[PDB]
């Protein structure tokens, strides 16, 4: 605002309002599953076992 009266009386009135905001969200979810199954031999009993 600028107000000049009689070309001699001056008045200035300068206002400012800055308002900044910031929001960040980060989510993360890692799932891992390893299943291993070896089967090497198969051991059976002879029918002639005592």
């Amino acid at each position: 605002t600028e107000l000049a009266l009689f070309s001699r009386v001056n008045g200035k009135f300068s206002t400012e309002f800055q308002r900044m905001k910031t929001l960040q969200v980060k989510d993360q979810a890692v799932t891992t599953r390893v299943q291993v199954r070896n089967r090497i031999y198969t051991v059976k009993t002879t029918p002639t076992s005592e």
Binding site: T42, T46, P47
Partner: protein, 38 residues
């Protein structure tokens, strides 16, 4: 009826898929040894 003489002489593995062993055709698993392997 053992191959350990053979392995000692030749230094070689013995084939591990040998026939002759009976096979239950119902549940499909080997069941016994029928033919003599010497």
């Amino acid at each position: 009826t053992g191959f350990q003489i053979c392995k000692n002489a030749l230094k070689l593995p013995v084939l591990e898929v040998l026939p002759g062993g009976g096979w239950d055709n119902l549940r499909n698993v080997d069941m016994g040894r029928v033919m003599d392997l010497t």
